[PDB]
Amino acid sequence: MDRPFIFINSAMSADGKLSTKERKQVKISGKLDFERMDELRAHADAIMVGIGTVLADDPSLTVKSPERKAARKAAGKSENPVRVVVDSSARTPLNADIFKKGEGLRIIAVSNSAPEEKIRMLEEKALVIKTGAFRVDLTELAAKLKEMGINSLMVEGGATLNWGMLSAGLVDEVYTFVGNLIIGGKTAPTFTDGEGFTENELLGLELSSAEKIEDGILLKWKVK
Amino acid sequence: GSHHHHHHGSMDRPFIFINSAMSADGKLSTKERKQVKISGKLDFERMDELRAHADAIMVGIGTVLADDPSLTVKSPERKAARKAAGKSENPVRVVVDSSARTPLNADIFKKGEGLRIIAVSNSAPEEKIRMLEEKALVIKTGAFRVDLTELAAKLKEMGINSLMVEGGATLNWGMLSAGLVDEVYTFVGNLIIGGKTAPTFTDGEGFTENELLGLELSSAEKIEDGILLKWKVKGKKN
Numbered sequence A: 001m002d003r004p005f006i007f008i009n010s011a012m013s014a015d016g017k018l019s020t021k022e023r024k025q026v027k028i029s030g031k032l033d034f035e036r037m038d039e040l041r042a043h044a045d046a047i048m049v050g051i052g053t054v055l056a057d058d059p060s061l062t063v064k065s066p067e068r069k070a071a072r073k074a075a076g077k078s079e080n081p082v083r084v085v086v087d088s089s090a091r092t093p094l095n096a097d098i099f100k101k102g103e104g105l106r107i108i109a110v111s112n113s114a115p116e117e118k119i120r121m122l123e124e125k126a127l128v129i130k131t132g133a134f135r136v137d138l139t140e141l142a143a144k145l146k147e148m149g150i151n152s153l154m155v156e157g158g159a160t161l162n163w164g165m166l167s168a169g170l171v172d173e174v175y176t177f178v179g180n181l182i183i184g185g186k187t188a189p190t191f192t193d194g195e196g197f198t199e200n201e202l203l204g205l206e207l208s209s210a211e212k213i214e215d216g217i218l219l220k221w222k223v224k
Numbered sequence B: 001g002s003h004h005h006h007h008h009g010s011m012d013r014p015f016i017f018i019n020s021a022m023s024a025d026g027k028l029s030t031k032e033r034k035q036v037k038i039s040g041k042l043d044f045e046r047m048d049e050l051r052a053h054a055d056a057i058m059v060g061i062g063t064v065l066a067d068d069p070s071l072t073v074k075s076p077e078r079k080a081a082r083k084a085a086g087k088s089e090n091p092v093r094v095v096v097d098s099s100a101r102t103p104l105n106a107d108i109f110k111k112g113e114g115l116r117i118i119a120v121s122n123s124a125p126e127e128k129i130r131m132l133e134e135k136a137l138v139i140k141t142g143a144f145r146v147d148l149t150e151l152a153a154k155l156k157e158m159g160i161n162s163l164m165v166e167g168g169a170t171l172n173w174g175m176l177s178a179g180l181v182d183e184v185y186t187f188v189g190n191l192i193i194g195g196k197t198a199p200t201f202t203d204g205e206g207f208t209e210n211e212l213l214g215l216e217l218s219s220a221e222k223i224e225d226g227i228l229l230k231w232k233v234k235g236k237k238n
Protein backbone atom coordinates (compact mmCIF):
# COMPACT_ATOMS: atom_id res chain seq x y z
CA MET A 1 0.00 0.00 0.00
CA ASP A 2 2.50 2.64 1.24
CA ARG A 3 5.59 3.95 -0.61
CA PRO A 4 8.57 6.34 -0.23
CA PHE A 5 8.45 9.88 -1.50
CA ILE A 6 9.40 9.25 -5.17
CA PHE A 7 10.91 11.72 -7.62
CA ILE A 8 12.35 11.40 -11.10
CA ASN A 9 15.50 13.38 -11.87
CA SER A 10 16.79 13.35 -15.45
CA ALA A 11 18.66 15.61 -17.85
CA MET A 12 17.14 15.91 -21.33
CA SER A 13 17.84 17.79 -24.53
CA ALA A 14 15.58 20.68 -25.60
CA ASP A 15 13.69 18.20 -27.83
CA GLY A 16 13.15 15.79 -24.89
CA LYS A 17 15.85 13.15 -25.44
CA LEU A 18 17.86 11.34 -22.78
CA SER A 19 20.38 9.96 -25.25
CA THR A 20 20.95 9.54 -29.01
CA LYS A 21 19.22 7.19 -31.50
CA GLU A 22 22.09 4.68 -30.96
CA ARG A 23 21.34 4.70 -27.19
CA LYS A 24 24.70 6.48 -26.59
CA GLN A 25 25.30 8.92 -23.74
CA VAL A 26 25.98 12.58 -24.55
CA LYS A 27 26.81 15.63 -22.46
CA ILE A 28 23.46 17.26 -21.71
CA SER A 29 24.26 18.99 -18.43
CA GLY A 30 27.39 20.72 -17.05
CA LYS A 31 29.23 20.81 -13.74
CA LEU A 32 26.53 22.74 -11.84
CA ASP A 33 23.73 20.28 -12.71
CA PHE A 34 26.12 17.41 -11.85
CA GLU A 35 26.63 19.04 -8.39
CA ARG A 36 22.87 19.39 -7.88
CA MET A 37 22.42 15.71 -8.88
CA ASP A 38 25.15 14.76 -6.38
CA GLU A 39 23.31 16.70 -3.59
CA LEU A 40 20.11 14.82 -4.48
CA ARG A 41 21.94 11.47 -4.36
CA ALA A 42 23.49 12.39 -1.01
CA HIS A 43 20.14 13.31 0.58
CA ALA A 44 18.08 10.47 -0.98
CA ASP A 45 17.75 7.16 0.86
CA ALA A 46 17.78 5.19 -2.40
CA ILE A 47 18.47 5.58 -6.13
CA MET A 48 16.68 3.51 -8.78
CA VAL A 49 17.67 2.82 -12.38
CA GLY A 50 16.37 0.37 -15.00
CA ILE A 51 18.32 -2.53 -16.46
CA GLY A 52 18.32 -0.69 -19.85
CA THR A 53 20.45 2.06 -18.28
CA VAL A 54 22.79 -0.40 -16.56
CA LEU A 55 23.39 -2.25 -19.85
CA ALA A 56 23.80 0.95 -21.97
CA ASP A 57 25.88 3.13 -19.60
CA ASP A 58 27.18 0.89 -16.77
CA PRO A 59 26.84 3.71 -14.19
CA SER A 60 28.13 3.40 -10.60
CA LEU A 61 25.33 5.55 -9.10
CA THR A 62 27.72 6.67 -6.34
CA VAL A 63 27.89 10.00 -4.58
CA LYS A 64 31.05 11.57 -6.12
CA SER A 65 31.90 14.41 -3.66
CA PRO A 66 34.09 13.23 -0.73
CA GLU A 67 32.46 15.91 1.48
CA ARG A 68 28.91 14.61 0.75
CA LYS A 69 29.98 11.00 1.39
CA ALA A 70 31.56 12.09 4.70
CA ALA A 71 28.40 14.00 5.64
CA ARG A 72 26.31 10.84 5.06
CA LYS A 73 28.80 8.68 7.01
CA ALA A 74 28.95 11.16 9.89
CA ALA A 75 25.16 10.89 10.17
CA GLY A 76 25.24 7.06 10.41
CA LYS A 77 24.33 6.21 6.83
CA SER A 78 26.38 4.38 4.24
CA GLU A 79 28.54 6.65 1.99
CA ASN A 80 26.06 5.97 -0.84
CA PRO A 81 22.28 5.66 -0.84
CA VAL A 82 20.76 2.26 -1.47
CA ARG A 83 21.16 1.49 -5.21
CA VAL A 84 18.26 -0.30 -6.87
CA VAL A 85 18.20 -1.87 -10.33
CA VAL A 86 14.83 -2.85 -11.82
CA ASP A 87 15.56 -5.98 -13.83
CA SER A 88 12.84 -8.57 -14.65
CA SER A 89 15.06 -11.42 -15.90
CA ALA A 90 17.98 -10.86 -13.52
CA ARG A 91 20.32 -9.81 -16.36
CA THR A 92 22.27 -7.27 -14.24
CA PRO A 93 25.93 -8.06 -15.08
CA LEU A 94 27.90 -9.54 -12.15
CA ASN A 95 30.86 -7.23 -13.00
CA ALA A 96 28.64 -4.11 -13.28
CA ASP A 97 30.03 -0.86 -11.88
CA ILE A 98 27.31 -0.67 -9.21
CA PHE A 99 29.02 -3.79 -7.73
CA LYS A 100 32.68 -2.71 -8.20
CA LYS A 101 32.38 0.83 -6.76
CA GLY A 102 31.66 2.13 -3.27
CA GLU A 103 30.03 0.81 -0.13
CA GLY A 104 26.31 0.46 0.55
CA LEU A 105 23.32 -1.72 -0.08
CA ARG A 106 22.53 -2.94 -3.59
CA ILE A 107 19.02 -4.24 -4.48
CA ILE A 108 18.11 -6.05 -7.70
CA ALA A 109 14.32 -6.06 -8.19
CA VAL A 110 13.48 -9.02 -10.41
CA SER A 111 10.30 -10.72 -11.58
CA ASN A 112 9.20 -14.18 -10.34
CA SER A 113 9.97 -15.48 -13.87
CA ALA A 114 13.68 -14.66 -13.40
CA PRO A 115 16.00 -17.74 -13.62
CA GLU A 116 17.03 -19.06 -10.19
CA GLU A 117 20.73 -19.57 -11.11
CA LYS A 118 21.18 -15.85 -11.95
CA ILE A 119 19.22 -14.80 -8.84
CA ARG A 120 21.61 -16.86 -6.65
CA MET A 121 24.74 -15.31 -8.25
CA LEU A 122 23.31 -11.79 -7.71
CA GLU A 123 22.38 -12.63 -4.11
CA GLU A 124 26.12 -12.87 -3.30
CA LYS A 125 26.35 -9.07 -3.98
CA ALA A 126 22.80 -7.78 -3.39
CA LEU A 127 19.42 -8.16 -1.79
CA VAL A 128 17.09 -9.61 -4.47
CA ILE A 129 13.40 -8.67 -4.22
CA LYS A 130 10.96 -10.71 -6.36
CA THR A 131 7.61 -9.26 -7.52
CA GLY A 132 5.21 -9.70 -10.47
CA ALA A 133 5.07 -12.30 -13.24
CA PHE A 134 7.16 -11.45 -16.31
CA ARG A 135 7.83 -7.89 -15.22
CA VAL A 136 8.66 -6.19 -11.93
CA ASP A 137 5.55 -4.99 -10.10
CA LEU A 138 6.65 -1.44 -9.31
CA THR A 139 3.82 -0.71 -6.85
CA GLU A 140 4.74 -3.81 -4.78
CA LEU A 141 8.47 -2.98 -5.05
CA ALA A 142 7.78 0.52 -3.82
CA ALA A 143 5.90 -0.69 -0.71
CA LYS A 144 8.70 -3.20 0.01
CA LEU A 145 11.34 -0.42 -0.19
CA LYS A 146 9.23 1.70 2.21
CA GLU A 147 9.05 -1.30 4.63
CA MET A 148 12.88 -1.45 4.73
CA GLY A 149 13.29 2.22 5.85
CA ILE A 150 13.45 3.94 2.43
CA ASN A 151 11.52 7.23 2.69
CA SER A 152 13.08 9.04 -0.28
CA LEU A 153 13.61 7.30 -3.65
CA MET A 154 15.31 9.02 -6.61
CA VAL A 155 14.45 7.50 -9.98
CA GLU A 156 17.53 8.35 -12.08
CA GLY A 157 15.66 7.07 -14.98
CA GLY A 158 15.70 5.19 -18.08
CA ALA A 159 12.97 6.27 -20.48
CA THR A 160 10.97 3.09 -19.97
CA LEU A 161 11.34 2.94 -16.16
CA ASN A 162 10.15 6.58 -16.03
CA TRP A 163 7.08 5.44 -17.98
CA GLY A 164 6.59 2.48 -15.61
CA MET A 165 6.75 4.61 -12.49
CA LEU A 166 4.61 7.46 -13.87
CA SER A 167 1.80 5.29 -15.40
CA ALA A 168 1.64 3.25 -12.15
CA GLY A 169 0.81 6.48 -10.26
CA LEU A 170 3.91 6.21 -8.04
CA VAL A 171 5.74 9.53 -8.66
CA ASP A 172 5.36 12.72 -6.59
CA GLU A 173 7.63 15.09 -8.49
CA VAL A 174 9.55 15.25 -11.77
CA TYR A 175 12.83 17.18 -12.19
CA THR A 176 14.00 17.79 -15.74
CA PHE A 177 17.24 19.64 -16.49
CA VAL A 178 16.65 20.86 -20.04
CA GLY A 179 20.04 21.16 -21.79
CA ASN A 180 21.08 23.47 -24.62
CA LEU A 181 21.17 21.03 -27.53
CA ILE A 182 19.02 19.15 -29.99
CA ILE A 183 19.64 15.37 -30.16
CA GLY A 184 16.72 14.33 -32.35
CA GLY A 185 15.68 10.91 -33.54
CA LYS A 186 12.45 8.89 -33.70
CA THR A 187 14.14 5.99 -31.79
CA ALA A 188 16.19 8.10 -29.38
CA PRO A 189 15.13 7.50 -25.75
CA THR A 190 12.92 10.35 -24.43
CA PHE A 191 12.16 11.42 -20.88
CA THR A 192 9.10 9.06 -21.00
CA ASP A 193 8.89 6.17 -23.48
CA GLY A 194 6.93 2.92 -22.82
CA GLU A 195 3.43 2.49 -24.22
CA GLY A 196 2.26 6.08 -23.64
CA PHE A 197 -1.03 7.51 -22.46
CA THR A 198 -4.07 7.90 -24.74
CA GLU A 199 -6.15 11.15 -24.77
CA ASN A 200 -8.22 9.98 -21.75
CA GLU A 201 -5.21 8.79 -19.68
CA LEU A 202 -3.00 11.93 -19.76
CA LEU A 203 -1.09 12.78 -16.56
CA GLY A 204 -1.50 16.33 -15.29
CA LEU A 205 1.35 18.30 -13.73
CA GLU A 206 1.81 21.59 -11.92
CA LEU A 207 4.96 23.66 -12.49
CA SER A 208 6.69 24.30 -9.13
CA SER A 209 9.78 26.18 -10.29
CA ALA A 210 11.95 27.08 -13.25
CA GLU A 211 15.61 27.95 -12.57
CA LYS A 212 18.31 28.70 -15.12
CA ILE A 213 21.47 26.72 -14.29
CA GLU A 214 24.58 27.31 -16.48
CA ASP A 215 23.46 26.89 -20.13
CA GLY A 216 20.16 25.07 -19.52
CA ILE A 217 17.11 25.30 -17.32
CA LEU A 218 15.77 23.13 -14.51
CA LEU A 219 12.02 22.49 -14.60
CA LYS A 220 10.42 20.98 -11.45
CA TRP A 221 6.90 19.56 -11.81
CA LYS A 222 4.49 18.25 -9.20
CA VAL A 223 2.45 15.27 -10.36
CA LYS A 224 -1.38 15.49 -10.03
CA GLY B 1 28.84 29.72 -32.13
CA SER B 2 29.46 28.65 -35.74
CA HIS B 3 25.81 29.07 -36.92
CA HIS B 4 25.34 32.05 -39.23
CA HIS B 5 22.23 33.69 -37.70
CA HIS B 6 19.98 35.05 -40.51
CA HIS B 7 17.73 38.12 -40.62
CA HIS B 8 15.20 39.71 -43.04
CA GLY B 9 18.01 40.93 -45.38
CA SER B 10 19.90 37.59 -45.66
CA MET B 11 20.44 36.20 -49.17
CA ASP B 12 20.08 32.42 -49.14
CA ARG B 13 16.86 32.07 -47.08
CA PRO B 14 14.24 33.61 -44.79
CA PHE B 15 14.76 34.02 -41.12
CA ILE B 16 13.39 30.65 -39.90
CA PHE B 17 11.94 29.80 -36.48
CA ILE B 18 10.23 26.67 -35.24
CA ASN B 19 7.22 27.09 -32.95
CA SER B 20 5.71 24.11 -31.12
CA ALA B 21 3.84 23.17 -27.99
CA MET B 22 5.05 19.98 -26.32
CA SER B 23 4.49 18.00 -23.15
CA ALA B 24 6.98 18.05 -20.26
CA ASP B 25 8.35 14.76 -21.69
CA GLY B 26 8.85 16.26 -25.18
CA LYS B 27 5.81 14.90 -27.06
CA LEU B 28 3.71 16.75 -29.68
CA SER B 29 0.78 14.30 -29.61
CA THR B 30 -0.04 10.74 -28.35
CA LYS B 31 1.28 7.41 -29.74
CA GLU B 32 -1.86 7.29 -31.93
CA ARG B 33 -0.72 10.66 -33.40
CA LYS B 34 -3.82 12.30 -31.88
CA GLN B 35 -3.93 15.98 -30.93
CA VAL B 36 -4.35 16.82 -27.25
CA LYS B 37 -4.64 19.95 -25.09
CA ILE B 38 -1.08 21.18 -24.45
CA SER B 39 -1.35 24.98 -24.65
CA GLY B 40 -3.93 27.22 -22.99
CA LYS B 41 -5.63 30.30 -24.44
CA LEU B 42 -2.62 32.57 -23.75
CA ASP B 43 -0.19 30.36 -25.72
CA PHE B 44 -2.85 30.18 -28.51
CA GLU B 45 -2.86 34.02 -28.53
CA ARG B 46 0.99 34.14 -28.58
CA MET B 47 0.91 31.66 -31.52
CA ASP B 48 -1.64 33.80 -33.32
CA GLU B 49 0.52 36.92 -32.89
CA LEU B 50 3.50 35.01 -34.34
CA ARG B 51 1.44 33.95 -37.31
CA ALA B 52 0.37 37.58 -37.82
CA HIS B 53 3.96 38.89 -37.97
CA ALA B 54 5.37 36.08 -40.13
CA ASP B 55 5.45 36.22 -43.91
CA ALA B 56 4.92 32.46 -44.24
CA ILE B 57 3.88 29.37 -42.21
CA MET B 58 5.24 25.95 -43.12
CA VAL B 59 3.90 22.52 -42.08
CA GLY B 60 4.63 18.93 -43.10
CA ILE B 61 2.11 16.85 -45.03
CA GLY B 62 1.80 14.62 -41.92
CA THR B 63 0.27 17.48 -39.93
CA VAL B 64 -2.19 18.21 -42.74
CA LEU B 65 -3.39 14.57 -42.87
CA ALA B 66 -3.52 14.08 -39.09
CA ASP B 67 -4.93 17.49 -37.94
CA ASP B 68 -6.20 19.33 -41.06
CA PRO B 69 -5.36 22.81 -39.67
CA SER B 70 -6.25 25.93 -41.72
CA LEU B 71 -3.06 27.77 -40.56
CA THR B 72 -5.03 31.05 -40.59
CA VAL B 73 -4.62 34.00 -38.25
CA LYS B 74 -7.69 33.60 -35.99
CA SER B 75 -8.12 37.05 -34.44
CA PRO B 76 -10.18 39.45 -36.64
CA GLU B 77 -8.15 42.32 -35.15
CA ARG B 78 -4.80 40.73 -36.20
CA LYS B 79 -6.07 40.07 -39.72
CA ALA B 80 -7.32 43.68 -39.97
CA ALA B 81 -3.95 44.92 -38.73
CA ARG B 82 -2.15 42.95 -41.46
CA LYS B 83 -4.65 44.19 -44.08
CA ALA B 84 -4.25 47.87 -43.07
CA ALA B 85 -0.51 47.58 -43.80
CA GLY B 86 -1.17 46.12 -47.29
CA LYS B 87 -0.52 42.46 -46.46
CA SER B 88 -2.84 39.56 -47.11
CA GLU B 89 -4.97 38.70 -44.00
CA ASN B 90 -3.01 35.44 -43.75
CA PRO B 91 0.70 34.81 -44.24
CA VAL B 92 1.75 32.46 -47.06
CA ARG B 93 0.91 28.83 -46.21
CA VAL B 94 3.44 26.22 -47.25
CA VAL B 95 3.05 22.42 -47.11
CA VAL B 96 6.08 20.15 -47.44
CA ASP B 97 4.49 17.33 -49.41
CA SER B 98 6.97 15.13 -51.39
CA SER B 99 4.38 12.86 -53.06
CA ALA B 100 1.68 15.55 -53.65
CA ARG B 101 -0.77 13.93 -51.20
CA THR B 102 -2.26 17.22 -49.86
CA PRO B 103 -6.04 16.64 -50.05
CA LEU B 104 -7.90 18.89 -52.51
CA ASN B 105 -10.55 19.52 -49.81
CA ALA B 106 -7.95 20.31 -47.10
CA ASP B 107 -8.86 23.18 -44.78
CA ILE B 108 -5.74 25.08 -45.96
CA PHE B 109 -7.57 25.60 -49.31
CA LYS B 110 -11.01 26.50 -47.94
CA LYS B 111 -10.31 29.04 -45.17
CA GLY B 112 -9.13 32.59 -45.79
CA GLU B 113 -7.30 34.62 -48.40
CA GLY B 114 -3.56 34.36 -49.16
CA LEU B 115 -1.12 32.36 -51.26
CA ARG B 116 -0.80 28.58 -50.87
CA ILE B 117 2.42 26.77 -51.75
CA ILE B 118 2.72 23.00 -52.01
CA ALA B 119 6.36 21.97 -52.05
CA VAL B 120 6.62 18.58 -53.87
CA SER B 121 9.48 16.42 -55.18
CA ASN B 122 10.29 16.08 -58.91
CA SER B 123 8.96 12.47 -58.79
CA ALA B 124 5.43 13.36 -57.52
CA PRO B 125 2.66 12.13 -59.90
CA GLU B 126 1.86 14.79 -62.55
CA GLU B 127 -1.90 14.11 -62.25
CA LYS B 128 -2.00 15.05 -58.54
CA ILE B 129 0.23 18.10 -59.24
CA ARG B 130 -2.11 19.52 -61.93
CA MET B 131 -5.08 19.06 -59.55
CA LEU B 132 -3.13 20.93 -56.83
CA GLU B 133 -2.17 23.74 -59.29
CA GLU B 134 -5.85 24.79 -59.45
CA LYS B 135 -5.54 25.85 -55.76
CA ALA B 136 -1.85 26.66 -55.19
CA LEU B 137 1.60 27.41 -56.47
CA VAL B 138 3.42 24.04 -56.80
CA ILE B 139 7.23 24.05 -56.47
CA LYS B 140 9.32 20.98 -57.34
CA THR B 141 12.68 20.42 -55.57
CA GLY B 142 14.75 17.26 -54.94
CA ALA B 143 14.59 13.86 -56.66
CA PHE B 144 12.43 11.84 -54.23
CA ARG B 145 12.05 14.06 -51.18
CA VAL B 146 11.67 17.83 -50.92
CA ASP B 147 15.05 19.57 -50.69
CA LEU B 148 14.45 22.05 -47.86
CA THR B 149 17.56 24.19 -48.48
CA GLU B 150 16.51 24.74 -52.11
CA LEU B 151 12.86 25.31 -51.03
CA ALA B 152 14.06 27.91 -48.49
CA ALA B 153 16.10 29.66 -51.24
CA LYS B 154 13.01 29.74 -53.49
CA LEU B 155 10.77 31.16 -50.73
CA LYS B 156 13.32 33.93 -50.17
CA GLU B 157 13.48 34.68 -53.93
CA MET B 158 9.68 35.22 -53.97
CA GLY B 159 10.07 37.81 -51.12
CA ILE B 160 9.37 35.67 -48.01
CA ASN B 161 11.66 37.04 -45.26
CA SER B 162 10.23 35.31 -42.19
CA LEU B 163 9.22 31.63 -42.04
CA MET B 164 7.36 30.08 -39.13
CA VAL B 165 7.80 26.29 -39.04
CA GLU B 166 4.80 24.92 -37.10
CA GLY B 167 6.31 21.68 -37.61
CA GLY B 168 5.55 18.15 -36.94
CA ALA B 169 8.33 15.97 -35.63
CA THR B 170 9.73 14.99 -39.01
CA LEU B 171 9.77 18.45 -40.65
CA ASN B 172 11.43 19.89 -37.52
CA TRP B 173 14.17 17.31 -37.91
CA GLY B 174 14.51 18.09 -41.64
CA MET B 175 14.94 21.85 -41.05
CA LEU B 176 17.19 21.44 -38.00
CA SER B 177 19.44 18.79 -39.62
CA ALA B 178 19.80 20.92 -42.77
CA GLY B 179 21.10 23.82 -40.56
CA LEU B 180 18.17 26.02 -41.68
CA VAL B 181 16.73 27.13 -38.33
CA ASP B 182 17.63 30.31 -36.44
CA GLU B 183 15.40 30.02 -33.34
CA VAL B 184 13.35 27.40 -31.57
CA TYR B 185 10.31 28.24 -29.43
CA THR B 186 8.77 25.42 -27.36
CA PHE B 187 5.81 25.97 -25.06
CA VAL B 188 6.21 23.19 -22.49
CA GLY B 189 2.79 22.11 -21.20
CA ASN B 190 1.89 20.76 -17.76
CA LEU B 191 1.37 17.12 -18.69
CA ILE B 192 3.09 13.82 -19.44
CA ILE B 193 2.04 12.15 -22.72
CA GLY B 194 4.60 9.36 -22.89
CA GLY B 195 5.16 6.66 -25.47
CA LYS B 196 8.12 5.30 -27.44
CA THR B 197 6.23 5.90 -30.70
CA ALA B 198 4.64 9.25 -29.71
CA PRO B 199 5.92 12.08 -31.97
CA THR B 200 8.48 14.30 -30.26
CA PHE B 201 9.61 17.85 -30.95
CA THR B 202 12.32 16.40 -33.24
CA ASP B 203 12.07 12.84 -34.66
CA GLY B 204 13.60 11.70 -37.99
CA GLU B 205 16.96 9.94 -38.04
CA GLY B 206 18.58 11.85 -35.16
CA PHE B 207 22.08 13.18 -34.53
CA THR B 208 24.97 10.96 -33.40
CA GLU B 209 27.25 12.25 -30.65
CA ASN B 210 29.51 13.90 -33.29
CA GLU B 211 26.75 16.00 -35.00
CA LEU B 212 24.77 17.39 -32.02
CA LEU B 213 23.16 20.79 -32.53
CA GLY B 214 24.10 23.31 -29.83
CA LEU B 215 21.61 25.94 -28.59
CA GLU B 216 21.60 28.98 -26.33
CA LEU B 217 18.70 29.77 -24.03
CA SER B 218 17.32 33.22 -24.93
CA SER B 219 14.52 33.34 -22.40
CA ALA B 220 12.22 31.35 -20.17
CA GLU B 221 8.75 32.75 -19.37
CA LYS B 222 5.89 31.17 -17.42
CA ILE B 223 2.55 31.42 -19.28
CA GLU B 224 -0.66 30.03 -17.70
CA ASP B 225 0.14 26.45 -16.50
CA GLY B 226 3.36 25.91 -18.52
CA ILE B 227 6.53 27.63 -19.65
CA LEU B 228 7.85 29.00 -22.94
CA LEU B 229 11.49 28.27 -23.70
CA LYS B 230 13.11 30.16 -26.55
CA TRP B 231 16.41 28.87 -27.83
CA LYS B 232 18.83 30.42 -30.33
CA VAL B 233 20.45 27.92 -32.66
CA LYS B 234 24.25 27.87 -32.36
CA GLY B 235 26.28 25.61 -34.63
CA LYS B 236 27.28 21.96 -34.36
CA LYS B 237 29.07 21.07 -31.06
CA ASN B 238 31.80 19.46 -33.22
Ligand SMILES: NC(=O)c1ccc[n+]([C@@H]2O[C@H](COP(=O)([O-])OP(=O)(O)OC[C@H]3O[C@@H](n4cnc5c(N)ncnc54)[C@H](OP(=O)(O)O)[C@@H]3O)[C@@H](O)[C@H]2O)c1
Residues within 6 Å of the ligand: A009, A010, A011, A012, A017, A018, A019, A023, A024, A025, A028, A049, A050, A051, A052, A053, A054, A056, A057, A086, A087, A088, A089, A134, A135, A136, A137, A138, A156, A157, A158, A159, A160, A161, A162, A163, A164, A165, A189, A193
Ligand atom coordinates in the same frame (compact mmCIF):
# COMPACT_ATOMS: atom_id res chain seq x y z
N1 LIG C 1 20.16 11.81 -19.52
C1 LIG C 1 19.69 11.20 -18.42
O1 LIG C 1 19.32 11.88 -17.46
C2 LIG C 1 19.55 9.70 -18.34
C3 LIG C 1 19.37 9.04 -17.11
C4 LIG C 1 19.23 7.65 -17.11
C5 LIG C 1 19.25 6.95 -18.33
N2 LIG C 1 19.42 7.61 -19.50
C6 LIG C 1 19.43 6.91 -20.79
O2 LIG C 1 18.22 6.17 -20.97
C7 LIG C 1 18.49 5.02 -21.79
C8 LIG C 1 17.91 3.76 -21.16
O3 LIG C 1 16.48 3.80 -21.08
P1 LIG C 1 15.60 2.48 -21.42
O4 LIG C 1 14.16 2.90 -21.60
O5 LIG C 1 16.27 1.65 -22.48
O6 LIG C 1 15.89 1.54 -20.13
P2 LIG C 1 15.49 1.80 -18.60
O7 LIG C 1 14.27 2.67 -18.58
O8 LIG C 1 16.72 2.05 -17.78
O9 LIG C 1 15.01 0.33 -18.17
C9 LIG C 1 13.80 -0.16 -18.71
C10 LIG C 1 13.71 -1.64 -18.44
O10 LIG C 1 13.46 -1.88 -17.06
C11 LIG C 1 12.82 -3.13 -16.95
N3 LIG C 1 11.57 -3.13 -16.15
C12 LIG C 1 11.24 -4.11 -15.30
N4 LIG C 1 10.02 -3.92 -14.76
C13 LIG C 1 9.52 -2.81 -15.31
C14 LIG C 1 8.27 -2.05 -15.19
N5 LIG C 1 7.31 -2.48 -14.36
N6 LIG C 1 8.13 -0.93 -15.94
C15 LIG C 1 9.09 -0.50 -16.77
N7 LIG C 1 10.26 -1.15 -16.92
C16 LIG C 1 10.53 -2.28 -16.23
C17 LIG C 1 12.38 -3.54 -18.38
O11 LIG C 1 13.14 -4.58 -19.01
P3 LIG C 1 12.99 -6.15 -18.56
O12 LIG C 1 11.52 -6.41 -18.52
O13 LIG C 1 13.73 -6.95 -19.60
O14 LIG C 1 13.65 -6.13 -17.22
C18 LIG C 1 12.52 -2.25 -19.16
O15 LIG C 1 12.74 -2.43 -20.56
C19 LIG C 1 20.01 4.95 -21.97
O16 LIG C 1 20.37 5.31 -23.30
C20 LIG C 1 20.57 5.93 -20.96
O17 LIG C 1 21.74 6.63 -21.39
C21 LIG C 1 19.56 8.93 -19.51
Ligand SMILES: NC(=O)c1ccc[n+]([C@@H]2O[C@H](COP(=O)([O-])OP(=O)(O)OC[C@H]3O[C@@H](n4cnc5c(N)ncnc54)[C@H](OP(=O)(O)O)[C@@H]3O)[C@@H](O)[C@H]2O)c1
Residues within 6 Å of the ligand: B019, B020, B021, B022, B028, B029, B033, B034, B035, B038, B059, B060, B061, B062, B063, B064, B066, B067, B096, B097, B098, B099, B100, B101, B145, B146, B147, B148, B166, B167, B168, B169, B170, B171, B172, B173, B174, B175, B199, B203
Ligand atom coordinates in the same frame (compact mmCIF):
# COMPACT_ATOMS: atom_id res chain seq x y z
N1 LIG D 1 1.06 21.35 -31.04
C1 LIG D 1 1.99 21.56 -31.98
O1 LIG D 1 2.83 22.44 -31.86
C2 LIG D 1 2.02 20.70 -33.20
C3 LIG D 1 2.22 21.28 -34.45
C4 LIG D 1 2.25 20.46 -35.58
C5 LIG D 1 2.08 19.08 -35.43
N2 LIG D 1 1.89 18.53 -34.22
C6 LIG D 1 1.71 17.08 -34.08
O2 LIG D 1 2.78 16.34 -34.70
C7 LIG D 1 2.29 15.03 -34.96
C8 LIG D 1 3.08 14.25 -36.01
O3 LIG D 1 3.84 15.04 -36.93
P1 LIG D 1 4.77 14.31 -38.05
O4 LIG D 1 6.22 14.53 -37.68
O5 LIG D 1 4.31 12.89 -38.23
O6 LIG D 1 4.40 15.07 -39.43
P2 LIG D 1 5.15 16.33 -40.14
O7 LIG D 1 6.55 16.53 -39.59
O8 LIG D 1 4.18 17.49 -40.16
O9 LIG D 1 5.28 15.85 -41.66
C9 LIG D 1 6.45 15.14 -42.07
C10 LIG D 1 6.37 14.86 -43.55
O10 LIG D 1 7.00 15.90 -44.31
C11 LIG D 1 7.33 15.32 -45.57
N3 LIG D 1 8.71 15.67 -45.99
C12 LIG D 1 9.03 15.78 -47.29
N4 LIG D 1 10.34 16.09 -47.45
C13 LIG D 1 10.88 16.19 -46.22
C14 LIG D 1 12.23 16.50 -45.67
N5 LIG D 1 13.26 16.76 -46.51
N6 LIG D 1 12.37 16.49 -44.32
C15 LIG D 1 11.34 16.22 -43.49
N7 LIG D 1 10.09 15.94 -43.92
C16 LIG D 1 9.80 15.90 -45.25
C17 LIG D 1 7.23 13.79 -45.44
O11 LIG D 1 6.08 13.26 -46.12
P3 LIG D 1 6.02 12.96 -47.71
O12 LIG D 1 7.32 12.23 -47.93
O13 LIG D 1 4.80 12.10 -47.95
O14 LIG D 1 5.91 14.32 -48.34
C18 LIG D 1 7.09 13.58 -43.95
O15 LIG D 1 6.36 12.40 -43.58
C19 LIG D 1 0.81 15.21 -35.32
O16 LIG D 1 0.02 14.14 -34.79
C20 LIG D 1 0.44 16.57 -34.75
O17 LIG D 1 -0.64 16.52 -33.81
C21 LIG D 1 1.86 19.31 -33.11
